[model samples]
Target chain A: IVPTRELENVFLGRCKDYEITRYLDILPRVRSDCSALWKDFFKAFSFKNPCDLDLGSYKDFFTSAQQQLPKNKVMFWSGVYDEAHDYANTGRKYITLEDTLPGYMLNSLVWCGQRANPGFNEKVCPDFKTCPVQARESFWGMASSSYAHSAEGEVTYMVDGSNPKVPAYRPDSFFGKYALPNLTNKVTRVKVIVLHRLGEKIIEKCGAGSLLDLEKLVKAKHFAFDCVENPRAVLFLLCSDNPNARECRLA
Target chain B: IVPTRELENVFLGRCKDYEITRYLDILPRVRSDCSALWKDFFKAFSFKNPCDLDLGSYKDFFTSAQQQLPKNKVMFWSGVYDEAHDYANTGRKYITLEDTLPGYMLNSLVWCGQRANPGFNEKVCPDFKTCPVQARESFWGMASSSYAHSAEGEVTYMVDGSNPKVPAYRPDSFFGKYALPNLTNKVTRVKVIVLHRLGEKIIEKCGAGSLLDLEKLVKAKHFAFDCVENPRAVLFLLCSDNPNARECRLA
Candidate 1:
């Protein structure tokens, strides 16, 4: 994440002059690989803060960013929440909490800071020693606060937050890392196996279930699985001492 | 639309809290059919002025509207420019002439404002109607300003005031019947049609175009076609006539 000071400085500099084309030329050079760049770019240009000399500069910046990014990359442009600043008060404006929460939870669930750390919610402090617990709680709290259980038993976890804690039962983390770069390619295979069992379990619980119900159940199971403390147990039950079991144990 | 002020007031009053479930309950009871309900719903929630509100409220309002009406109904939301009223600067902080111009140009190309005047670029008025020709020229400038044309040619138009022509496109004027709804769908269809015609267009424009050139043309066509002159065009194009026609006249 870009520091507040750097964000401010870059924003202020952009605001001093309204040059959409020029700024668009410069942004891609700054950071192209990061998924959060568009959010950071939009945040830097926020006029709600006292730092902005002109709010219009933001329009220019966005215009420029759109002009520079690739077609697939431009999806981020539309993804930006117009009321990003109002998120805390409004619990996510524009998009459904169901949609936005997953991203936030994913990030928090995958990266567990420390126990009860609050750092996840608050801006990372320059003085790292001040409130470690607060920081860690904030990080974990992101997942805890945003996490929700679907009508079905499936759980959906967000991998986009600052700190993500992947429960031990999730084969995604295990088979994912072992598979390395091609991990995402294997997601479908793992999902099919995991979700099939989850589907059976949900049918057993609900008795009569529709496709929609099954879908909701699968999503809920994913979320629940992410929260499981010992994912290996479930993996053991499913795979029963297969080579993939070793991968699950490693994860 | 719900023409009576009393009914509008009641709907607005209920919506003031911005709860989707409440809207869902209210919509079916008030309007006889889904279309009437949606037309009124859009009219009521669409902001006439830029107000400091959350986007979630807007989304909720739409979701409720959709629940009672049709899934395809197009909707829009607007907010006050973030720098409109500064405690320190007051009028000075209001978006200035410098910031409004480019925004207007971007707005125009994006089909953001009124139908007759579909762009955001605008000029300051001496009074209500008087303007020097130069000021008028500045106001009605061409769509592409100095901003770089992306390889993909897509751009993000925003509410920020980096350009000088911002004053003319008032929040009330822009969002009030002026803003088109769901042009995104129309643009998508136009792009598909345009892509199929690319081979002929390339042969006609440049004796022989390369595959890369064809790819670029298709991408650029889609990018530009995404902005719809009238969002209602989507319904007409989908239900009434061929989407690729040069003009779609609504009855």
Candidate 2:
């Protein structure tokens, strides 16, 4: 979590991989100079306070790396990275922000710099919730905003229904703060897939609980919205990890 | 092709991307040091004659990069890189050698050493067909051999059905010389998906022409085999490129 050891190498490598792989064809035409992206990425937070980073710091990096997300392929998720990704299947089925260039380059990575000349702080980075505008948070904020802006046609949003402490839709979550609010009229529909743990008690379902709140919010933005509870495809993924559980039985 | 220009950087980046991406989870446990793979890869062809390369030269590199392929997922291809890859869909549907570590690191790349001091020759590299044993040929040979050796369950082989010149299967082809011979008893079946261009005349169907020869060859190896004349799934992809064509009509 300490900025992901050798972060630059990993970032540059992911960028180049996205640029060169056949997977690039999964989305629309787009290319980036990984070196230029790296340079701008480094410049974003290299000499700034990790706790007080600005979202604008990543403008050049995002500009260099952003590509057009294919219509109906963009997937937004809250508290369900594993299930969303398992369902996304690396853009063969759906395209998550993580499947995009900026998202692929920075997914699940922790990074920040300190008030020092070395440009990278090996020891510490601020927590997203505790800091005003954490470096990593800003990166995802801009990434999510751009992702939502580019999404056209119907988009999918995944959320966890079994979390006891959190609602399926929260006004403060990344999806709410950075993605949903940024969705333009290009997006016509929002399909919410709520996932439940294999044996856990289900707390939310379509037109029930917080999913209704999500639907209302989406409708307020003039987008048609629908929700499905524990989609079979996603439940199948959960069953893969717990195949012997009662929920996995054919009967 | 000049070794794909900055071949080491590209290779190392690809290795790292495969190691860290969620796609890595598609395969079984496999962790590799990109630097180590790079070193062994460089040692395989550097300071050696480009045309007289030995297959054993890549042993170390193969040892470092090889991983167990998933059951029933291995896909071998002959003269159908684009079609095979489009159908493969990056292991979401089938696993090709290009989906594997060594293959991902070196796919479609050309690299070789010269008699001169500097290891990589910028001016020239031998063609895979023209040379007795070319640098790229040995890399793919070892990669494909290891791929076939690791394959289990049913495997898939894709070929170009429209090519009037090349047989559906040939003894000298890479799939013939490296993969088919290397497949062991672990492999129970081989499914052939023969692809043809949208408007081209069909030269071979499942049980006719060189496809018959291919079936005989596969059975001679004591493997249960079947061939399909452009599976609808693959034709769907071809149709994507020529949606307006008569062959693609849904009437």
Instruction: Judging by lDDT against the true structure, name the best candidate.
Output: 2
Q: List DockQ for all candidates.
A: 0.01, 0.15
Give the C-alpha miss distance for residue B210 in model 1, angstroms: 14
Report each candidate's C-alpha RMSD, comma-separated, in the order given: 23.4, 7.4
- Which 10 consecutive residues of model 2 chain A have the lowest summed lDDT? A234-243
On residues A127-159, what C-alpha lDDT tens digit does candidate 1 reach at each position? 333444334233222222222111112212211
lDDT of 1 by residue, B121-233 (tens): 12221231233332222311211111111011122122221223332124233322223222232322211111111112212111122223433543554533232211231
Q: List the residue pairs that clash in candidate 2.
A: B3-B110
Label model 1 with its docking quality class.
incorrect
Off by over 4 Å in 2: A28-32, A133-136, B1-6, B16-54, B63-104, B107-137, B144-251
Question: Could you say which candidate leads in DockQ?
Answer: 2
| B52-153: candidate 2 lDDT, tens digit per residue | 686777878788788887788889988898778766767877888878777777777767787788877866776567667544567778878888888899
Winning candidate number (TM-score): 2
